[PDB]
Amino acid sequence: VKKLVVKVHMDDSSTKSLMVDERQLARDVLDNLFEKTHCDCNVDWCLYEIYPELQIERVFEDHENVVEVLSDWTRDTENKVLFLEKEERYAVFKNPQNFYLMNAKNKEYLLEESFCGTSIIVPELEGALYLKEDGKKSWKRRYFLLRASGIYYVPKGKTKTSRDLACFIQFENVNIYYGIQCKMKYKAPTDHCFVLKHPQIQKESQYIKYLCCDDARTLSQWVMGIRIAKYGKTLYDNYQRAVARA
Numbered sequence: 001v002k003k004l005v006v007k008v009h010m011d012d013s014s015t016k017s018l019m020v021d022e023r024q025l026a027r028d029v030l031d032n033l034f035e036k037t038h039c040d041c042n043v044d045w046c047l048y049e050i051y052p053e054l055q056i057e058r059v060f061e062d063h064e065n066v067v068e069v070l071s072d073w074t075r076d077t078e079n080k081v082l083f084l085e086k087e088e089r090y091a092v093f094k095n096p097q098n099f100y101l102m103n104a105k106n107k108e109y110l111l112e113e114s115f116c117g118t119s120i121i122v123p124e125l126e127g128a129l130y131l132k133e134d135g136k137k138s139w140k141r142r143y144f145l146l147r148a149s150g151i152y153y154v155p156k157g158k159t160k161t162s163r164d165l166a167c168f169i170q171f172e173n174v175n176i177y178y179g180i181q182c183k184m185k186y187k188a189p190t191d192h193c194f195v196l197k198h199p200q201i202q203k204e205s206q207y208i209k210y211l212c213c214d215d216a217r218t219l220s221q222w223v224m225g226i227r228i229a230k231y232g233k234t235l236y237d238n239y240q241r242a243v244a245r246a
Contacts, residue, residue, distance in 0.1 A: 048082035132210035171230035
């Protein structure tokens with residue numbers, strides 16, 4: 001019964017307003033746009049969330065309920081939905097070797113082990129990243145480790161062993177975003193930044209976590225890796241559903 005009008009922004013500055021009820025997923029809105037825009041229907045097409053105030057942005061995952069995501073938005077919000085190509089969204093499924101470390105046979109076997117087993121296998125990703133200090137234009141280099149449940153950090157004066165590892169954040173409690181203009185705004189070492197915060201946060205908060213990578217490659221590895229850990233088999237299912245429409 002619950003209905004909502006969503007203004008979807010196109011790349012050429014134009015907009016297309018759709019009627020979206022409480023039952024529609026990002027998958028359904030995309031199929032609707034596919035018919036109306038007459039696009040090539042490639043897997044990179046996605047819904048894209050932008051927060052102009054906090055200057056953060058992320059892809060919608062295809063299984064996400066659109067109304068539910070927009071219900072977190074304030075009445076006076078500046079937030080926009082965009083329809084554009086993001087080739088990073090399913091990068092692991094096109095080239096799994098770029099993340100889990102190749103021909104069609106070895107690509108298939110690697111993905112079936114990582115996604116089609118009993119539990120998911122998350123890339124063995126670890127490295128130092130710059131974490132922003134709460135409310136301060138100050139950044140600190142800490143060693144981080146990617147796990148199935150969340151990201152773990154090495155406390156200053158501890159070792160890499162799992163017993164010494166403390167949990168930084170759990171993926172259940174955050175969406176992952178790109179950080180925009182973090183270098184200029186907060187004196188981030190680079191602009192290769194990702195942002196971890198709860199869907200409900202719509203303004204400045206200490207619980208918005210800002211992480212800066214040394215290069216563009218490191219950013220790509222962490223965003224893809226965290227999305228694998230957070231979304232798991234559903235992300236694989238999203239991709240298979242997208243290939244069938246291409």
